[PDB]
């Protein structure tokens, strides 16, 4: 197909940077469609390693131009440090990318909410990547956030930033108790950029729609994963944007039937950053094997991965949320020497009631046990296979049971975080 989406099956970390990096090879345009900063998608190009946070994962190639959709919240502080590191790398930044003026964008006082009611919450808080991610999503809805089209005039932005500054600082210092963020600072900081941000906007889904009338082949690249979603996921412990498939419309503008094959980035083990439910949670030696191994931190904020088994009933919902196209099965090399291997196919319910069938709110996940069907594991090494014959049969066996319990066909396989250690078996641009 020609437009492809690229996004996480289960709470993100799965590999989707790799894997976009990977396929944009073809590819014209690659689209960020939601999310912020929040977002650490790694590359490993040759060995040397990129970790991008606000900016879309094609920026590494010339070919290809990367776009920030209109479902993005934009941090401009952020965005200019990712931009400096990027190119004092050789990566002309500026030359491939552009972005929507519908972006709302992330300031200092974002941060300062964030913080405060992370505190707020005690010891039952969300674990949130510490940018203004949720607070700017909720300014935007809130009809007083301020998008890059603002920044078009400087007086009215001045305004506008006053007011919504006001506002914001009275219930961080009367509320919360907390210290105000300056006026003066953020415009100052934020109108010291206005220009560059400014001089890359364009009209995204007018391009989009260009682009596909074209057949331009187009990536779009997900953030976060499915059970993270603000609607669908463990709510409230979650993320405040739609990181299932029907973001990409909201978020970018292209109409929803352009949506030719969504790849479903799913890792062979699960991993969790942050509170929430985890039925396949594991706290015994092969934790901790499954996180060092798999080098498991946060790309973004460092802190470690919680992990456990790979659960088919929670990656169930995100095929079909997300009406999936087809698996890229991430992190197969990270199995290597287990004994034994096992994933979820059923949930225990705290009543009795076998499920195959997930919980919505957090809430309704607290009981529940997962019920494992138990693979024989391999002693082989995968790492870096780029042949399904340099994979060893149980690893083919357990393959094939994910496709089994899924119905949906893993067409991609990675043995590695290098752009090459990776199998494509079928090709989603052709697909
Ligand atoms: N061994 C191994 N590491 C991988 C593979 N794919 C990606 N990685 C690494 O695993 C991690 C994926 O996490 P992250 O970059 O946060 O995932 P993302 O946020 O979806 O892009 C990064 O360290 C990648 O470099 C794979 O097949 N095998
Ligand atoms: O308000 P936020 O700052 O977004 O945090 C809310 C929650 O969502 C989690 N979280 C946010 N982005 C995440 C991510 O991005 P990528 O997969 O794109 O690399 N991968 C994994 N977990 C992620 C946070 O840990 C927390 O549970
Ligand atoms: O890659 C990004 N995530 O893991 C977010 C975090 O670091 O918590
Ligand atoms: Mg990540």
Same mark, same amino acid.
């Given at each position: 197909?020609?437009?492809?989406?690229?996004?996480?099956?289960?709470?993100?970390?799965?590999?989707?940077?790799?894997?976009?990096?990977?396929?944009?090879?073809?590819?014209?345009?690659?689209?960020?469609?939601?999310?912020?900063?929040?977002?650490?998608?790694?590359?490993?190009?040759?060995?040397?390693?990129?970790?991008?946070?606000?900016?879309?994962?094609?920026?590494?190639?010339?070919?290809?131009?990367?776009?920030?959709?209109?479902?993005?919240?934009?941090?401009?502080?952020?965005?200019?440090?990712?931009?400096?590191?990027?190119?004092?790398?050789?990566?002309?930044?500026?030359?491939?990318?552009?972005?929507?003026?519908?972006?709302?964008?992330?300031? !200092?006082?974002?941060?300062? /909410? &964030?913080? %405060? $009611?992370?505190?707020?919450?005690?010891?039952?808080?969300? #674990?949130?990547? =510490?940018?203004?991610?949720?607070?700017?999503?909720?300014?935007?809805?809130?009809?007083?956030?301020?998008?890059?089209?603002?920044?078009?005039?400087?007086?009215?932005?001045?305004?506008?930033?006053?007011?919504?500054?006001?506002?914001?600082?009275?219930?961080?210092?009367?509320?919360?108790?907390?210290?105000?963020?300056?006026?003066?600072?953020?415009?100052?900081?934020?109108?010291?950029?206005?220009?560059?941000?400014?001089?890359?906007?364009? !009209?995204?889904?007018?391009? /989009? &729609?260009? %682009? $596909?009338?074209?057949?331009?082949?187009?990536?779009?690249? #997900?953030?976060? =994963?499915?059970?993270?979603?603000?609607?669908?996921?463990?709510?409230?412990?979650?993320?405040?944007?739609?990181?299932?498939?029907?973001?990409?419309?909201?978020?970018?503008?292209?109409?929803?039937?352009?949506?030719?094959?969504?790849?479903?980035?799913?890792?062979?083990?699960?991993?969790?950053?942050?509170?929430?439910?985890?039925?396949?949670?594991?706290?015994?030696?092969?934790?901790?094997?499954?996180?060092?191994?798999?080098?498991?931190?946060?790309?973004?904020?460092?802190?470690?991965?919680?992990?456990?088994?790979?659960?088919?009933?929670?990656?169930?919902?995100?095929?079909?949320?997300?009406?999936?196209?087809?698996?890229?099965?991430?992190?197969?090399?990270?199995?290597?020497?287990?004994?034994?291997?096992?994933?979820?196919?059923?949930?225990?319910?705290?009543?009795?009631?076998?499920?195959?069938?997930?919980?919505?709110?957090?809430?309704?996940?607290?009981?529940?046990?997962?019920?494992?069907?138990?693979?024989?594991?391999?002693?082989?090494?995968?790492?870096?296979?780029?042949?399904?014959?340099?994979?060893?049969?149980?690893?083919?066996?357990?393959?094939?049971?994910?496709?089994?319990?899924?119905?949906?066909?893993?067409?991609?396989?990675?043995?590695?975080?290098?752009?090459?250690?990776?199998?494509?078996?079928?090709?989603?641009?052709?697909?």
């Amino acid at each position: 197909g020609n437009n492809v989406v690229v996004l996480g099956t289960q709470w993100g970390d799965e590999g989707k940077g790799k894997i976009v990096d990977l396929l944009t090879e073809r590819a014209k345009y690659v689209v960020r469609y939601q999310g912020g900063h929040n977002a650490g998608h790694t590359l490993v190009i040759n060995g040397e390693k990129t970790v991008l946070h606000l900016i879309p994962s094609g920026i590494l190639r010339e070919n290809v131009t990367s776009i920030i959709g209109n479902g993005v919240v934009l941090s401009p502080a952020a965005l200019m440090k990712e931009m400096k590191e990027l190119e004092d790398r050789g990566i002309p930044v500026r030359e491939r990318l552009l972005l929507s003026e519908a972006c709302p964008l992330i300031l !200092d006082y974002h941060v300062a /909410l &964030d913080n %405060a $009611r992370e505190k707020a919450r005690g010891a039952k808080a969300i #674990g949130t990547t =510490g940018r203004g991610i949720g607070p700017a999503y909720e300014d935007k809805v809130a009809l007083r956030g301020l998008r890059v089209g603002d920044l078009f005039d400087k007086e009215t932005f001045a305004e506008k930033l006053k007011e919504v500054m006001e506002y914001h600082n009275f219930q961080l210092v009367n509320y919360y108790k907390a210290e105000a963020v300056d006026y003066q600072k953020v415009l100052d900081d934020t109108m010291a950029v206005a220009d560059i941000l400014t001089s890359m906007v364009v !009209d995204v889904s007018d391009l /989009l &729609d260009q %682009a $596909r009338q074209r057949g331009d082949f187009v990536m779009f690249e #997900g953030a976060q =994963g499915t059970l993270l979603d603000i609607d669908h996921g463990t709510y409230p412990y979650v993320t405040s944007s739609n990181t299932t498939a029907g973001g990409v419309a909201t978020g970018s503008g292209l109409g929803p039937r352009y949506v030719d094959y969504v790849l479903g980035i799913l890792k062979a083990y699960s991993t969790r950053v942050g509170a929430g439910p985890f039925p396949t949670e594991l706290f015994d030696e092969t934790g901790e094997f499954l996180c060092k191994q798999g080098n498991e931190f946060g790309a973004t904020t460092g802190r470690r991965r919680r992990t456990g088994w790979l659960d088919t009933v929670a990656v169930r919902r995100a095929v079909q949320l997300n009406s999936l196209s087809g698996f890229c099965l991430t992190k197969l090399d990270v199995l290597d020497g287990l004994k034994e291997v096992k994933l979820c196919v059923a949930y225990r319910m705290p009543d009795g009631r076998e499920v195959t069938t997930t919980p919505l709110a957090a809430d309704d996940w607290k009981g529940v046990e997962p019920i494992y069907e138990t693979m024989p594991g391999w002693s082989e090494s995968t790492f870096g296979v780029k042949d399904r014959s340099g994979l060893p049969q149980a690893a083919l066996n357990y393959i094939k049971r994910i496709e089994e319990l899924t119905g949906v066909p893993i067409d991609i396989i990675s043995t590695g975080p290098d752009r090459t250690e990776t199998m494509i078996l079928r090709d989603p641009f052709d697909a």
